[PDB]
Amino acid sequence: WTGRQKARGAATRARQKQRASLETMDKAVQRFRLQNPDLDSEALLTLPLLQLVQKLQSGELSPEAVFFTYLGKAWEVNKGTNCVTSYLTDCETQLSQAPRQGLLYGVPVSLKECFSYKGHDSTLGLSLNEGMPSESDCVVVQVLKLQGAVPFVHTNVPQSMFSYDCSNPLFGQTMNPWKSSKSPGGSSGGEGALIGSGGSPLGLGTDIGGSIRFPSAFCGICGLKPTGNRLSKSGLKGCVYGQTAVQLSLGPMARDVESLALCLKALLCEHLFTLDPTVPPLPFREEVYRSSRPLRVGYYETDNYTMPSPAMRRALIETKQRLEAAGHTLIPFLPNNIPYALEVLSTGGLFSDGGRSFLQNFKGDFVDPCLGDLILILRLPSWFKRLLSLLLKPLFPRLAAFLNNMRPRSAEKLWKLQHEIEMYRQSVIAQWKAMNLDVLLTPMLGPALDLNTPGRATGAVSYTMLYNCLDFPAGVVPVTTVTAEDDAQMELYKGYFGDIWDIILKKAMKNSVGLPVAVQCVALPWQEELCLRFMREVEQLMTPQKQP
Amino acid sequence: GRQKARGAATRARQKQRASLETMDKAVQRFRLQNPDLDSEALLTLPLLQLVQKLQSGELSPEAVFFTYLGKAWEVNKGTNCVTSYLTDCETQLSQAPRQGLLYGVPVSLKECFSYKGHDSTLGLSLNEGMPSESDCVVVQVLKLQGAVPFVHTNVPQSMFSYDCSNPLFGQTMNPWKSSKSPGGSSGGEGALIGSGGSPLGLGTDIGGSIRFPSAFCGICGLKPTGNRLSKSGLKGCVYGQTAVQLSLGPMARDVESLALCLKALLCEHLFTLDPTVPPLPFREEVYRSSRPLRVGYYETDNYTMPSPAMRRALIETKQRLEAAGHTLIPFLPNNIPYALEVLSTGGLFSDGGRSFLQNFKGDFVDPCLGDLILILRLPSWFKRLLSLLLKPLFPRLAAFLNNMRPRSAEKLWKLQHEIEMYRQSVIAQWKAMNLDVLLTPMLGPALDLNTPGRATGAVSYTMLYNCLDFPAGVVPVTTVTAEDDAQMELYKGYFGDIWDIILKKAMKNSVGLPVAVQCVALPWQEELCLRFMREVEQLMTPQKQ
Ligand SMILES: *[C@](O)(CCCCCCc1ccccc1)c1nnc(-c2ccccn2)o1
Ligand SMILES: *[C@](O)(CCCCCCc1ccccc1)c1nnc(-c2ccccn2)o1
Ligand SMILES: [Cl-]
Secondary structure (H helix, E strand, O other): OOOOHHHHHHHHHHHHHHHHHHHHHHHHHHHHHHHOOOOOHHHHHHOOHHHHHHHHHHOOOOHHHHHHHHHHHHHHHHHHHOOEEEEOOOHHHHHOOOOOOOOOOOOEEEEEOOEOOOOOOOOOOOHHHOOOOOOOOOHHHHHHHHOOOEEEEEEOOOOOOOOOOOEEOOOEEOOOOOOOOEOOOOOOHHHHHHHHOOOOOEEEEEEOOOOOHHHHHHHOOEEEEOOOOOOOOOOEOOOOOOOOOOOOEEEEEEOOHHHHHHHHHHHOOHHHHHHOOOOOOOOOOHHHHHOOOOOEEEEOOOOOOOOOOHHHHHHHHHHHHHHHHOOOEEEEOOOOOHHHHHHHHHHHHHOOEOOHHHHHHHOOOOOOHHHOOHHHHHHOOHHHHHHHHHHHOOOOHHHHHHHHOOOEOEHHHHHHHHHHHHHHHHHHHHHHHHOOOOEEEEEOOOOOOEOOOHHHOHHHHHHHHHHHHOOOOEEEEEEEEOOHHHHHHHHHOOOOOOOHHHHHHHHHOOOOOOOEEEEEEEOOOOOHHHHHHHHHHHHHHHOHHHOO | OOHHHHHHHHHHHHHHHHHHHHHHHHHHHHHHHOOOOOHHHHHHOOHHHHHHHHHHOOOOHHHHHHHHHHHHHHHHHHHOOEEEEOOOHHHHHHHOOOOOOOOOOEEEEEOOEOOEOOOOOOOOHHHOOOOEOOOOHHHHHHHHOOOEEEEEEOOOHHHOOOOOEEOOOEEOOOOOOOOEOOOOOOHHHHHHHHOOOOOEEEEEEOOOOOHHHHHHHOOEEEEOOHHHOOOOOEOOOOOOOOOOOOEEEEEEOOHHHHHHHHHHHOOHHHHHHOOOOOOOOOOHHHHHOOOOOEEEEOOOOOOOOOOHHHHHHHHHHHHHHHHOOOEEEEOOOOOHHHHHHHHHHHHHOOEOOHHHHHOOOOOOOOHHHOOHHHHHOOOHHHHHHHHHHHOOOOHHHHHHHHOOOEOEHHHHHHHHHHHHHHHHHHHHHHHHOOOOEEEEEOOOOOOEOOOHHHOHHHHHHHHHHHHOOOOEEEEEEEEOOHHHHHHHHHOOOOOOOHHHHHHHHHOOOOOOOEEEEEEEOOOOOHHHHHHHHHHHHHHHOHHHO
């Protein structure tokens, strides 16, 4: 499996398809601008989604104007970020058929590459998925269209999507819009970079360990990861099938909280519930989202696993203080047994089979540098992972724990693991109830890491993956930017373990002055609305300008 | 080495016995003080009217409680369905919230519903003398709704059986005929409710365990979508198996009781006490709807040959539905053999039965489990070899055996994905015919005692819907006639294997026994399923409403 001829051909075809996509976009944009030289494109692009939707609904703005202006912006920002892999060809005719009463009528939407779109590949950056066009739209894409939205691009992902960087051997490397030496986060990185630079008002991503929340935080936009089965995953392209211990979740990314709420409201409709009867038909509860009642907010400033950067810590602390001044009750709270939840439950659930299924995607392919040593490590014989685990344990317990829990096991041992996950979930729910919390405020990893380092700082997924394990809805809101004072204090950063993950993270988070920093908002399962209500509160207190 | 298990049986039997004497003493005191109460009339009131009389003050909770307690005690004498009297229920009786939707309603509980201070043995020695620390969530919710859970009812050992006997409390009998099984695993519930000793009960179902007892005993039952109700605090024997989900649900004498129970359970108390349950309140208007339905139906699953009674029940129900304005459409979910032999069996026994078997170490194996334990205990290589040998002549037996082997997490992932895609397949098949609901035969009449464990094939009609995770319920529609029974002599299964042979003899001698049909809707469509069951009930037994 050393021959790369097939992988080379795939990359050649994918690069040509991307190139032609971009040229097509460029021509449509130019043809539109010629016919409409007087359109104030800037005013349109800076309209918050809610106002854009309202102008589309009234006819003040035509769907064509919104579409081509956003298309032009996407084409331009793509020049510096390489976030767009494919222009969704037929979308110009979808545009002229958008249901006029849709809650998203005329809204251009960007899709992580894994959302199946009829006639396009969802490569996931893998050569084995190239030249295999989807034969239908996935359910959420169908629902977006029935709501009058216009999906227009596929955006880049790191190879296989199992990464919080954003590069692959087919379409190459996506860069942070704020600083080209920084990762935009991942795996919904193309989305983060496109939306964070103003090239799309709304995107969909997916999240199994933070893949909606990393790019949102790194690129300074809002993102929500719902409860796993709140939205349909039917028709999504994946790399691993039937793993249910740690469920994948899909959700919106956008420039403000109102936009995520609008998106969930449009998605959680009869169309969705009929197209996919396996989704519990819970309508979006607007009144919970709009509530202005005082909250009991649990919080922590560190999970004692990944030492927060000075920027993360300042962000958390200032938010906590504004929430208290606003009349909320802030209560110290830390989910129990985080090291166990991350090392045993999460890692174990994601790699119950030693990585064998996951590795099947890589046979004969290039392994992108952004994946670090993951593929090499997964490839290690089970016995040798175990032996290495016992050796590293006295020195680097964190590294030993991960290694040990990435081993293959029987169905019997997986049942045991699944029961522990269920019990862990109940244990954190009980802590929460005993403290009578409404929501939970936590740090969110930031600022953006240097390109090619996320794959070498696996420990830093601790803040986000805990909530995939727990399957609680969790969103991120940008609340500040790194100051020079913050950046200089990185030199004093040691990490709790001082292993290679802490060493890499320390270096990767330096030189980040000016970069956005977020906090994370969490609520109980199926409480997406309450989670958004809290996010809305945070956004309003930290960045009052984002709301009318 | 079963001495400890004999001690467990001795202790359990003493507790059951003391529980029964306590019940009798309280019933005798109450009667002496209330010699003029019309017990007959109270006991026959449909639940809806009983609830209204408790709510209006026309009937006292004490009167209802002690009247049912006496009835439960009496019917237990011929069925052995009660394992425990829930010690503090009399004080719950006096603190029962007046505003509750179930105010003063005595409720029976399958033994796996944890009740503070009580064992949930599952008929297993290893669970004896391990009292629950607290009530399970559904019990908490019942009490918050003013209901009074008053007994634990019997289950077959481990609950993985559709008969109802275990080494601790012994064998439960069908109230209609003492030589017949009450079904299972919610068999105690079936026996108790079917003989009038309780107006409402809760069971669980992973392969038909709410529906068998309901059909065999001539009552109504609903198996909701797996995660519609909270399983928090439920006692189980296998943990972490998520391919085929356990579901919990109500059993009662009529459909309206089932809808009332779901309505009372699907409240803020439940959703707050167990946030992992999607907070979907009961949708009254779907339940109450009177719009004509597109009803898919089959007379047979081409897997278990229906008994003449089952077939007649299905056809008569179909005709009555057609005459009532509904559209009947022939429809059979695709690849049922696959769903049963590969998906369901493989899902239930992905580990070759090792987790299951753990419960039986040092314990007796009830005869009602047949050869299940012995078979599961065989080495994988031997199940495989035996499977290849059976395949030419007995493909059904071969398929089950081969799919009960242990496998890696990798293969379990593959299996889980196949279950998911099969669900999508049947849903697409269902939507291509634009169905609202699906009408199917339900296994019946009740099998002779100790035969269910030897007629595993017969779970075909029920287990398909655990695999697919669709709400499914059963409604009694007729009784076995002299002709139905005589026609059993002509009965031939499609396979001619031992399961077909056992079933044929097991369903004979059933004159007068109840027979049901099964109603099915799509995931999360419990209300539509109940709407349909209500219709079947109204059309086939008009006096229930
Ligand atoms: C993202 O959530 C992935 C974010 C990075 C997660 C890294 C997790 C980890 C844990 C232990 C060792 C190494 C790495 C995401 N988005 N999509 C997906 C995904 C994953 C699997 C299948 C489909 N999609 O992950
Ligand atoms: C009932 O639904 C069980 C009914 C009988 C199912 C027999 C299935 C079968 C399949 C293949 C070979 C042999 C037998 C029920 N109720 N509760 C449970 C249960 C099961 C496991 C754990 C907890 N509860 O099953
Ligand atoms: Cl669910």
